[PDB]
Amino acid sequence: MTFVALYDYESRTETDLSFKKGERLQIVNNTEGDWWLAHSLTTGKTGYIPSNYVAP
Amino acid sequence: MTFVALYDYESRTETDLSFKKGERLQIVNNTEGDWWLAHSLTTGKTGYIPSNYVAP
């Protein structure tokens, strides 16, 4: 299961990956799952969250 | 489309969201899409990437 970078991306944090268009990438499996941008109705705060940590 | 936090999560970076179990969350749509942990076969580097930036 291999992918390829459509555009350049420069990292904005210490945990993301910088790459250039054409690079070949493999998805790594982690226990955290996909990450989503979320808004907390409880706190009003907003930011990325690990999918597996929540349920509908 | 609302979810609820199964576990506490403490933020590790400046972009993720800290929350506590039971919090209610709403997914925000961004152009970047889901984020995945990836390994670059081209560079050997590893880190999170925005889904929409790549194709199989």
Author numbering:
A (entry chain A), B (entry chain A): 84 to 139
Give verbatim excerpts from the published study on this entry.
The non-receptor c-Src tyrosine kinase participates in different signaling processes by phosphorylation of tyrosine residues in a variety of proteins, modifying their properties, such as enzymatic activity, subcellular localization and stability. The c-Src tyrosine kinase is made up of six functional regions: (i) a N-terminal fatty acid-acylation domain, (ii) a unique domain, (iii) a Src homology 3 (SH3) domain, (iv) a Src homology 2 (SH2) domain, (v) a catalytic domain, and (vi) a C-terminal regulatory domain. Of all those, the SH3 domain plays a key role in the regulation of the tyrosine kinase activity through the recognition of an intramolecular Proline Rich Motif (PRM) and, additionally, through the interaction with other PRMs present in other proteins. To better understand the mechanism of 3D-domain swapping formation in c-Src-SH3 domain, and its plausible implication in amyloid fibril formation, we have solved the crystallographic structures of the WT and three mutants at position 128 of the c-Src-SH3 domain.
All the crystals of the dimeric form of the c-Src-SH3 domain belong to the hexagonal space group P6522 and show a single chain of the c-Src-SH3 domain. The intertwined dimer is generated by symmetry, and the structural motifs of the SH3 domain are formed by two polypeptide chains: residues (N-terminal)–111 from chain A and residues 117–(C-terminal) from the chain belonging to a symmetry mate (thereafter, chain B in the intertwined dimer structure). 3D-domain swapping of the polypeptide chains occurs as a result of an open-like conformation of the n-Src loop (Asn112-Gly116) which acts as a hinge loop. On the other hand, in the Q128RD, the longer side-chain of arginine displaces W3, while W1 and W2 are placed at the same position; and in the Q129KD the sole water molecule conserved is W1, which is placed at hydrogen-bond distance of Lys128 and Glu106. Thus, the amino acid at position 128 is responsible for the hydrogen-bond scaffold around those water molecules. Interestingly, W1 is the only water molecule conserved among the different structures: it shows very low B-factors and small ASA values in all the structures in this work. All the intertwined dimer structures described at this work show the presence of a PEG molecule at the interface of the two chains forming the dimer. Whereas the WT did not show a large pH-dependence of the Tm, our results confirm that: (i) the mutation of Gln128 to arginine or lysine, which bears a positive charge, results in the stabilization of the c-Src-SH3 domain, since these species unfold at higher temperature than the WT; and (ii) mutation to glutamate, which bears a negative charge, results in the destabilization of the c-Src-SH3 domain. However, at temperatures below 20°C, we did not observe the formation of high molecular-weight aggregates after several days.
